[PDB]
Design a protein around this ligand. Structure first.
Ligand code: G4P
Length: 285
């Protein structure tokens, strides 16, 4: 867990801008389950119009259709979005490809100014737990100081044919200010720090978006006019999470729901629903 505090935030912003000076293209890594909510709130300030590949990681845990709506969003902003599964090695060569496309104009201008062709230089930036070290390791085909006194120095990794990748990610902070965004971040395991309200949010999401699947997963049936407590009760009763007679063990039920959602045990969802976020988008623009 990264402890954020104002000083550490300033140090992170400063350091990431410094790293960005060294590169032609930046890979902004986001969670495919929340392509918009898993972004740093000042990411655009930090990146400052640098050619950008947006990588929607953990696509194996998300909804492709909703993802494709976010990809359209990133395209409309002039970025180059791709989706990958960094852990299981799915769709990876598309990264270099995207970088080539994102820097094409820059290198045409370089070529016209007489310069030789060279390797594209890149780095990865994003909030914690979105898969940055996983992706670096997978691109490097190795596990990226050893002695206690000794600090790691940053190095380039040769990736694919024409790509040089900084071996150290830029780590920035998650969105803090909106309560719903906080619940989404908690539901994806992006942050881990009110759990009952997180479980309520996750339940309501599933009721509204995949009701039959939720029912099938816990093998329950719940009155459509019931309040959310009845879903907690149905789940607790069916799985026998019981306390002091036949009272429902709510903290156990809450924990089970959060686990099942975080680990894609019920289904593969994108919690950022594009059509529902139009106002927040209007605000951020
Ligand atoms: N399903 C899936 N998972 C991914 C993908 N990329 C990363 N992960 C997982 O997400 C977790 C965080 O990845 P990191 O690589 O450490 O993220 P970070 O550097 O940005 O802080 C890791 O799991 P962990 O918490 O360390 O343990 P575990 O869940 O792998 O058991 C990692 O295995 C992906 O594409 N698909």
């Amino acid at each position: 867990v990264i402890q954020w505090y104002p000083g550490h935030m300033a140090k992170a912003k400063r350091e990431v801008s410094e790293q960005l000076k060294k590169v032609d293209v930046v890979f902004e890594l986001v969670d495919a389950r929340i392509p918009y909510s898993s972004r740093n709130p000042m990411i655009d300030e930090v990146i400052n119009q640098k050619p950008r590949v947006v990588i929607l990681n953990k696509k194996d845990m998300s909804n492709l259709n909703e993802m494709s709506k976010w990809e359209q969003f990133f395209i409309d902003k002039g970025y180059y979005p791709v989706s990958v599964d960094a852990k299981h090695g799915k769709n990876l060569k598309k990264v270099e490809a995207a970088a080539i496309k994102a820097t094409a104009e820059k290198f045409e201008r370089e070529k016209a100014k007489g310069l030789k062709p060279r390797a594209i230089r890149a780095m990865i930036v994003g909030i914690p737990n979105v898969g940055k070290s996983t992706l670096i390791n997978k691109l490097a085909k190795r596990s990226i100081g050893n002695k206690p006194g000794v600090t790691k120095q940053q190095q380039w990794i040769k990736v694919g044919n024409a790509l040089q990748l900084l071996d150290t990610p830029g780590i920035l902070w998650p969105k803090f200010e909106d309560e719903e965004v906080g619940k989404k971040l908690s539901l994806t395991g992006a942050i881990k720090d009110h759990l009952d309200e997180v479980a309520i949010y996750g339940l309501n999401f599933l009721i509204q978006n995949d009701l039959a699947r939720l029912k099938s997963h816990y093998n329950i049936e719940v009155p459509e006019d019931a309040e959310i407590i009845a879903w907690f009760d149905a789940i607790g009763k069916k799985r026998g999470l019981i306390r002091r007679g036949n009272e429902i063990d709510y903290e156990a039920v809450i924990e089970l729901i959060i686990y099942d959602i975080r680990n894609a045990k019920i289904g593969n969802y994108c919690f950022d629903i594009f059509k529902d976020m139009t106002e927040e988008l209007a605000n951020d623009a």
